[PDB]
Design a binder for this molecule. Structure first.
Ligand code: 8KB
Length: 330
């Protein structure tokens, strides 16, 4: 089997991408944030504290003939931005882009943090990291991808994120029309439960390539690119007036600047992030100071190849017994 679903930016800054997902019988369609950096599928629901729901579409298991309470199971998760949610668990039929999984754990939120409440466009998350990160207790649950994996033609999914434009998540096949050149595959470590890999280095603009190993994770659920302070300082040093601002919480630059590209290495291959991708616009409406798309990972503990990097590539998440990550230009 295979699935193919369009993913769409939630706003004009590509802060996140939402993908329609069908849950239950008859289908209830929710727009979920596909997140290769976590492993829970959770949704706003009829159980979510009313004051914490503001415009989201909710899952109502009582209206689904295939929903069953997973008795005694609870879940609680916190994300890298400090957001969080928790609740209980149903099993139900879940379909993405024509690909159907029965008995999927659908985690129903009883509580969500304000950042989720304030974002009316995201109805929940669909985790695509390894199931060892799933937070359901006392019986840990499998991701949509892990459940689907047996039925898939190939144990892969691909992320093809758009720049200010819709993109595609495919399951079970690699669309050879969706990229140019060849795909370069690189080893993945699952030891921390992430799609963790090692970049072979970087270049700033037309500068020479610096060969250096950078361990990081491929994370569709993170907006920006977070790299070691040495790397990020070398990048912003090439932008007149750029600086790190503690008040703003990262690198800012004059909106009048032209940003250089940023290249990262995948084995012997090179993925080039255009300068425009790194511009996240005025820090507040009307400001002449703009927020940078490349930021330091120093306060995080881990380097993160977020949307800023991933949208510059066609990315293959290979969930074979020996998992790998593939990157191609597009
Ligand atoms: O908000 C980000 C999304 N990715 C999962 C881990 O970090 C949290």
């Amino acid at each position: 089997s295979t699935g193919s679903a369009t993913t769409t930016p939630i706003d004009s800054l590509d802060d996140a991408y939402i993908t329609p997902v069908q849950i239950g019988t008859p289908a209830q369609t929710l727009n979920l944030d596909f997140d290769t950096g976590s492993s829970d599928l959770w949704v706003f629901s009829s159980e979510t504290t009313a004051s914490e729901v503001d415009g989201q579409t909710i899952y109502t298991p009582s209206k689904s003939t295939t929903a069953k309470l997973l008795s005694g199971a609870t879940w609680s998760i916190s994300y890298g931005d400090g957001s969080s949610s928790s609740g209980d668990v149903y099993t139900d039929t879940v379909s993405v882009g024509g690909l159907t999984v029965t008995g999927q754990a659908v985690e129903s939120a009883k509580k969500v943090s304000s950042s989720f409440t304030e974002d009316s466009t995201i109805d929940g998350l669909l985790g695509l990291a390894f199931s060892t990160l799933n937070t359901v207790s006392p019986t840990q649950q499998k991701t949509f991808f892990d459940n689907a994996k047996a039925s898939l033609d190939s144990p892969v999914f691909t992320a093809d994120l758009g720049y200010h434009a819709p993109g595609t998540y495919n399951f079970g096949f690699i669309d050879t029309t969706a990229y140019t050149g060849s795909i370069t595959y690189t080893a993945v470590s699952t030891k921390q439960g992430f799609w963790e890999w090692t970049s072979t280095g970087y270049a700033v603009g037309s500068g020479t390539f610096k060969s250096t190993s950078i361990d990081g994770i491929a994370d569709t659920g993170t907006t920006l690119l977070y790299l070691p302070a040495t790397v990020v300082s070398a990048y912003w040093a090439q932008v007149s007036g750029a600086k790190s601002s503690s008040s703003v919480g990262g690198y800012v630059f004059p909106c009048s600047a032209t940003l250089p590209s940023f290249t990262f290495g995948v084995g012997s291959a090179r993925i080039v992030i255009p300068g425009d991708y790194i511009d996240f616009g005025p820090i507040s409406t009307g400001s002449s100071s703009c927020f940078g798309g490349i930021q330091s990972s120093a306060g995080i503990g881990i380097n993160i190849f977020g949307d800023v990097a991933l949208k510059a590539a066609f990315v293959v998440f290979n969930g074979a017994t020996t998992p790998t990550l593939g990157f191609a230009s597009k």
